[PDB]
Amino acid sequence: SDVLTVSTQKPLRDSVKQALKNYFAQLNGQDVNDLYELVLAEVEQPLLDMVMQYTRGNQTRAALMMGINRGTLRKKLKKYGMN
Amino acid sequence: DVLTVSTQKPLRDSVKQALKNYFAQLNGQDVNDLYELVLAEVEQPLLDMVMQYTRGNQTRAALMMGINRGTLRKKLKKYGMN
Amino acid sequence: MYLTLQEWNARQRRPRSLETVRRWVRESRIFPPPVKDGREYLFHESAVKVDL
DNA sequence: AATTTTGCATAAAAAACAGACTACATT
DNA sequence: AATGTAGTCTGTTTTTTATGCAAAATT
């Protein structure tokens, strides 16, 4: 049924929900102002590492598989110190 | 380190395992929308959690998320969160 | 009626790199010649590659 | 009653986009 | 020879943003 799942198997969305549930528990009155970016960077980097590993360093195929502009991929790879 | 999931391994490790499993099931299938696919799986729980924390207050949810309120109501409308 | 350079190519018997398909437009190898509307090319759904 | 949130409109900055083109690689 | 890719650019469109404001809702 679900295409992105983790090892019994469960959806990746269920693991994100649990990761944030823990974060809000270990948030003893802290003001948070960058939660989107924090989650995005934690999910973008392993996606970039896995796709680049899959395409064997081929940027053009990674971008084509991801459905993002090649110039956009190159920027994200630079952001995470990967190129 | 800050975003982790119980045995406690980090979240990036759960994304890596989901994609390893995904590439394995690609039986001749031609991938074209992987960024959005991952993003939509990660965006729905984030929006669910942050709104649950702010008790449905979008003003506070946008501030916590570091995004603009307009951008938030757009993402909410996309995942049918109305 | 009209496709993007990417759509047109995806529909080809042997799709190529978008870099290759652009070189073709730049070299006048696509007939009828795609028009550039802003940032993109617009291929008529019937457009073919020609041997020069 | 007072204060905050929301829904929606702008305009501009920021991001993502298609393409151009060269040097070198792979087919 | 023709095609494919990294890297460096240009110009265009789309998304995000700050801001103003009135109605609605919460305090």
Author numbering:
A (entry chain A): 8 to 14, 23 to 98
B (entry chain B): 9 to 15, 24 to 98
C (entry chain E): 1 to 52
What is the paper's account of this structure, in its own sentences?
During the site-specific DNA recombination reaction that excises phage λ from the chromosome, the bacterial DNA architectural protein Fis recruits multiple λ-encoded Xis proteins to the attR recombination site. Fis is a bacterial nucleoid protein that functions in transcription, replication, and recombination reactions. Xis is a winged-helix DNA binding protein, which is expressed at high levels shortly after prophage induction, but by itself, exhibits low binding specificity. To explore the structural basis for Fis recruitment of Xis to the X2 site within the λ prophage attR recombination site, X-ray crystal structures of three different Fis–Xis–DNA complexes were determined.
The ‘FX2’ structure contains a Fis dimer, an Xis1–55 monomer (hereafter referred to as Xis), and a 27 bp DNA duplex representing the native sequence except for an A/T base pair at each end. The most important base-specific contact by Fis in high affinity Fis binding sites is mediated by the guanidinium group of Arg85 to a guanine, and in the FX2 structure, both the N7 and O6 atoms of G7b are within 3 Å. Thus, each base of the position 7 C/G pair is directly contacted by either Fis or Xis (Glu19-C7:N4, 2.7 Å). The Arg23 side chain is present in both conformations in the FX2 complex with the dominant rotamer contacting the DNA backbone, as is the case for the X2 site within the X2–X1.5–X1 microfilament structure. The FX2 structure reveals for the first time a layer of interconnected solvent molecules spanning most of the major groove interface with Fis. Our three crystal structures of Fis and Xis bound to the F-X2 DNA segment reveal little (70 Å2 in the FX2 structure) or no (both FX1-2 structures) shared surface between the Xis and Fis proteins. The closest approach in the FX2 structure is between the polar end of the Xis Gln6 side chain from helix A and the Fis Leu79 side chain methyl, which emanates from its positioning helix C. The 27 bp DNA in the FX2 structure exhibits an overall curvature of 61° (calculated by CURVES), which is within the lower range of bending angles measured in X-ray structures of Fis bound to different DNA sequences. The DNA backbone over the outer 4 bp of FX2 that is proximal to the Xis basic surface (Xis residues Arg14, Arg16, Arg23, Arg29 and Lys49) is then pulled up to 6 Å closer to Xis relative to the Fis-F1 complex, enabling hydrogen bonding by Xis Ser17, Thr20 and Trp24 to proximal phosphates. The result is a snug fit between the peptide backbone and the minor groove surface (surface complementarity score between the Xis wing motif and DNA in the FX2 structure is 0.826).
